[PDB]
Amino acid sequence: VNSFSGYLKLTDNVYIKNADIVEEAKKVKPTVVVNAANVYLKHGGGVAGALNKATNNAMQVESDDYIATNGPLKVGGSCVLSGHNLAKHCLHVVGPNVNKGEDIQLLKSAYENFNQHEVLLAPLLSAGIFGADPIHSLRVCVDTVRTNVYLAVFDKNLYDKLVSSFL
């Protein structure tokens, strides 16, 4: 038993809810919140900008030190950093950005990072301003992640569509 509330069970291990991931994080304080990162950890907009804003820019400060030491992530890759006031840890995961022309096949590799963590609060990778179909992202999530994932979906109208179209 865990503390996530109101989530709709999709599969053995995947649950979904219409909520702002930042607000979910603030309430739950999960062990791991997933950020929809880019390779430079520049948290400007979407999930990343919203999470970073809630940390008063501490996420960005930590991220800039990470990049200065280690260089950029790979598309499909990840790193574990602090969760600041939102979670114990933040797993920064880079899904492919269709609006930048990146290979959608890398979405499965991105979701594989979730399997290193027993339980996660997460967004659908590559969706929103990353340009991919959220219905596709949810399918890849369910078919790739084996650990327990609680998906927060910002847009209420998309959430209803994701549920109604789920196979």
Ligand X SMILES: O=C(N[C@@H]1c2cccc(O)c2C[C@@H]1C(=O)O)c1ccc2[nH]c(CO)nc2c1
Contact residues toward ligand X (CB under 6 A) are 20-22, 46-47, 50, 123-124, 127-128, 134, 153-155, 158
Closest CB to ligand X: residue number: 128
State the nearest-atom distance from the C-beta of 17 to ligand X, in Å.
11
Q: CA distances (Å), 156 to each of 40, 117, 121, in order? A: 30, 27, 18
Residue (25 or 68) nearer to ligand X, CB: 25
Burial level of 123, CB count in 10 A (0-12/13-18/19+)? buried
Residue (150 or 154) nearer to ligand X, CB: 154
Sort residue 81 into left (φ over 0), alpha (ψ -120 to 50) or beta. beta
Do β-strands 32-36 and 89-93 pair in parallel, antiparallel, or remain unpaired?
A: parallel
State the nearest-atom distance from the C-beta of 19 to ligand X, in Å.
9
Residue (65 or 155) nearer to ligand X, CB: 155
